[PDB]
Every structure is written in structure tokens, then in C-alpha cells.
């Protein structure tokens, strides 16, 4: 049996704990939190830590992990399977991407139409968008959008939008939380990824959602799709069984259980979202290089500094 | 006008060349050599180099350069033009990826057909293949398979490949070569790039042709795509047009002008082949890491300890 320290969001641990469980007998333990705290947790705890795998929504929060060498390596050839343009290969080959999510913006489309987008993830962070475009700074895919400005466009750019977002934005504790403030109308839009939004519109109905999700394209940096994956731990006492998870998420079963739940890119090129997403090749979604520790370090420093945090 | 540092085969600098000139009047004049000697020379000119872009056959051949920061930055926007699956980003955007080549087996179909073939690269060095094997160990596609090997497969494996080439295979001077030497019917299989077949295709006749093309797939190492590509040289004079080259050959004329002289892969989603290439796609090519100088003497390393060189 294994434990994982779960920082996705809880629908998609269940959905692939139970999948597995009853594909191989093995029963999973998630330890449900922050994909944060978590990796804070397992750095304090080194190799003492009772977790086996860590899944997260962000491959960036392996990177301290990796630098430190505290997961261990999976085989390349379960990398290859999920390697698609965009993804991130992790260095060591100790950790692996899985599904992506894309950077979306939702509006109301009670309010809006495509024809009052922007043509660039840098043009809401405008006056012109004064109280009316809702962020959420504490969100990974944030940070990464962020790692993804500062790399694309340099760090005054990059300044210059957070410093915009301070001014004009409002601020949402979660990607949820801002997905429904437009929903209840309190902002026009928002930025956040696009899983939310498509789990939202099966539950209720798209016909009874005032939100529509608007794809900036042309390569912009607010195209951008970050990645979710998994690690096992190199301290893990079940080694035979964390790599057999690991891979299990990589098969097209594992697959194909994550995305029946979410609403998140499936990597294999065999697997079909049965959400009808909008086509990956149609996101025109840019290439960035994998977040370091140190990227990411700097991200945080830029946030600082435009005083968001 | 421009000087055109060219490590290029001669058929594509000139026809991308021509192509420029007569899009915009700036006239190139082309240095002609091997990748390898060129990027020496460049070390050695340094700031005095007369050289204004450096067009070479393996984008391996920029790390050198780059890490001594010899190459002037591109545009983000020009470099997410040819950013496909597998294509390499260069860290300091100081040079472009613009071309892909295959790796593939060409094989005497008049005397072997695809059953006979390997499912592994690994499996020609063997001596099931005594004598029957053609390779090109000064080919600098061949380096870049050597670091796919140790990045892939590790150390131990690919120097037993290398050993097992020295004590079973051909050597050949050049690719071109190697290909001929099927042709002609000294060995019945080499490890060669896609593009020489196709162009001898072309010019006379597949129906005429003895060899025939073999896809190894899988994500096998053997199934590597490497990338030819283009940087300006900081020391340059002319940045204006040096920077309006390379941008030139991210273009979908530049890519068009190039696919119709010579049978790579252009890279950008908006241009056709006419040689009628295997689909990328279809290829199953491994994502491999981009080659850096430091994997560069590894596998340099490793060829002398298989006593290749
Ligand atoms: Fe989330
Ligand atoms: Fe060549």
C-alpha cells in the first residue's frame, strides 16, 4: 500500500487513487493539501518522510525537491510517453509531467463578447480594466505565468504587468473563487486556468453559465499551458509500488481516469478528453523552458516587488 | 550585404540564400566548410570575425560559442516560430532551431526488406551485423546520437553501441558516401539522416534506386530527429541585416525556400514539403534534451574510449 501527498485538487487524486486500487489491488493514502505546504513538509521531513509519491498541480514545486535529490528516478521510457511540445523533462529524470492545464481568461459573456478581449495577457492590466479583471497571486499556475513573462518578455515587462494587476485587478484567494465572481457578476473576467471552468459547465449546464473562456493565442505568454505531475520519494519504502503508481498515471488507463474527472490536457497522444476541449495545436500556446528553483525564486522576488506580496 | 558563415551542405545555403537576396536586395556571400572547423575558426576570430551569421548543420554546434557569448540574441517572437515538439530552445535566445533531420536506417531493399530490420538502434552493432552495417562517425548527427544514447540509455549502454560499431560496422567518411555504398551494393544497410535519400530520389527516380528508407520508431534513440539552425555573431557589423536573415529563415518563405532544395523537416506549422516526407508524427522521435558543450566532450570521450577516434 502507498501513501501520496496529494497537492492536486481532490477530485483528481480520487479519481486515479481509485482507479489504480482497482487495477492492481494496491490501496492509496492521500494526504490532501497545498501542493506548497506539502513540499515544505516533505523538505523538513528528508528521509524520514512516510510519503511515497507527491502529486502536485505544478511540476515548478518539484524543482527544491530535485536540486536537493530527494525523489528518485523513473524510467525514461515512461517519460517519452508523455512528452509532448511544451512539456518540461525533468533534468534527473525524477519526476513527471502528466497532464496540462492552459491559462484561460473567463469572461462574462453577458457582458462581453471575444471582441472585447485583448490581443495580449499584458493589455488587462490596465487602467482601461479598472476593478473589472479578477487575479489570483497565491495560484501556481501564476507564478509560472509569471517565470513564463519575465523569460518571454524580460523583467520590466513582467514588473510592469504585476504592478498593473496591484493597481487595476481584483484580488480572488483561488482560481474557484474567481471563477464564481464572474459567474455572480461581481467582475467581467478573470484570469485562471482552464479545468475550472469545463468542470463547472458539466456539473450545471453551459447553457446556464454566463462565463465563456476567451484563448489569447499567437504564442502569447498568456497562452501559456503549465504542467501537473508526480515524484516518488527517494526516501519511499515501497519503491516497487510508488514506481508502479508513477507509471500507472502515465498508462493510458491512468490517463484516461484523470481526464474523465477533470478537465485537464491528457499528454498521450492516445487518449481523448471526453470534455471537448479546445485542441491543444489550436492554443498556439508558447514553449518555455522548465521553472528552476531559482526561477522561481525570482518570480517571488518580482511579486514582492510590485508589492503584491 | 552580408557574410554567411556556411557549415550548411552547399544546395541549402544557396538556395536560401538566393531566395533572400531576392526578397530584399541584401546580397549574401557564403563561407563555405565543415560545421566543426567553421565554429573554431569563429573561436579563434573572435571579435574580429568578418562573419555575420553562422548557418551550420547541427545546432549542437552553437553550444561552445554561446557559453563564450559570442552570438547576439534573437526575437522571443522569431524563436517561438520554429518551437515544435523535440526542438531545442537555446537558453541566452542566441541562436534559432530551423531545420529537422532524421536519423533513419537505409537498407537495400533488393536484398533486405523491413523484417529484416531491428526494433533498436542497439541491435545493428551486433555481430549479427558483421561487416553488414555502414556508419559515419565523424558525422556530426552521429555525435548528437551518441549524447541521445547516454542521456536515454546511459553510459554503459551506449559505449558497448560504440564498441560494438568498431568491431562490426563499415566506416564511412561522410554520409553521402555511406549512401552510395548501399547504393553500389557494398553494404546493404547504413545509419545515415533522412534527407540525403530523398534528394537522391528525387533526382533520379525511387524507381531506380536500390535502398529504401527504414523508420526504427518507438521512441527508440535510433528514431532521433536533430536540428540544423542559424545565429548572428555578436561581433558583427551588419546587425540589421544579419538579424533579418535569420528572421528571413523562421519566415514561411525563408522555410519554403529551404523544403524545396533540400528534404528536412521545416518546422513551421504553415509549410509542406514537397518531397513527401514521413510524418513527424509518425516518426516517434525521443524529446531529448539540447546538446551542451559539457555533453559534447562526453561524447567525444566515449567515442575515443570505444577506440572510435
Ligand atoms: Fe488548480
Ligand atoms: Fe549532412
Not at 492545464?101 to 453577458?110: A, G, I, L
Not at 504564442?219 to 503549465?226: C, K, T
Request: glycine share 6%.
Amino acid at each position: 500500500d502507498i501513501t501520496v501527498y496529494n497537492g492536486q485538487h481532490k477530485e483528481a487524486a480520487t479519481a486515479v487513487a481509485k482507479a489504480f486500487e482497482q487495477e492492481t489491488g494496491i490501496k492509496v493514502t492521500l494526504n490532501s493539501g497545498k501542493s506548497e505546504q506539502l513540499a515544505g513538509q516533505l523538505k523538513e521531513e528528508g528521509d524520514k518522510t512516510p510519503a511515497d509519491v507527491f502529486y502536485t498541480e505544478q511540476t515548478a514545486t518539484f524543482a527544491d525537491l530535485s536540486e536537493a535529490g530527494l525523489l528518485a528516478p523513473i524510467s525514461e521510457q515512461t517519460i517519452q510517453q508523455t512528452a509532448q511540445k511544451g512539456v518540461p523533462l525533468a533534468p534527473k529524470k525524477d519526476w513527471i509531467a502528466l497532464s496540462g492545464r492552459s491559462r484561460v481568461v473567463v469572461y462574462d459573456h453577458t457582458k462581453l463578447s471575444e471582441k472585447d478581449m485583448e490581443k495580449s495577457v499584458l493589455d488587462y492590466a490596465t487602467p482601461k480594466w479598472k476593478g473589472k479583471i479578477g487575479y489570483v497571486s497565491t495560484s501556481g499556475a501564476f507564478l509560472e505565468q509569471v517565470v513564463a513573462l519575465s523569460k518571454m518578455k524580460g523583467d520590466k515587462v513582467a514588473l510592469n504587468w504585476l504592478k498593473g494587476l496591484k493597481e487595476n485587478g481584483k484580488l480572488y484567494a483561488k482560481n474557484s473563487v474567481a471563477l464564481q465572481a464572474v459567474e455572480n457578476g461581481e467582475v467581467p473576467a478573470a484570469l485562471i486556468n482552464n479545468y475550472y471552468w469545463y468542470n463547472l459547465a458539466k456539473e450545471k449546464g453551459v447553457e446556464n453559465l454566463k462565463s465563456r473562456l476567451y484563448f489569447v493565442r499567437h504564442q502569447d505568454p498568456g497562452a501559456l499551458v503549465s504542467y501537473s505531475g508526480a515524484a516518488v520519494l527517494k526516501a519511499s519504502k515501497n519503491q516497487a509500488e510508488a514506481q508502479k503508481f508513477v507509471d500507472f498515471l502515465a498508462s493510458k488507463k491512468g490517463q484516461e481516469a484523470l481526464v474523465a474527472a477533470r478537465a485537464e490536457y491528457p499528454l498521450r497522444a492516445d487518449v481523448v478528453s471526453p470534455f471537448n476541449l479546445e485542441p491543444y495545436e489550436k492554443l498556439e500556446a508558447p514553449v518555455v523552458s522548465a521553472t528552476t528553483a531559482q526561477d522561481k525564486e525570482h518570480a517571488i522576488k518580482l511579486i514582492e516587488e510590485a508589492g503584491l506580496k
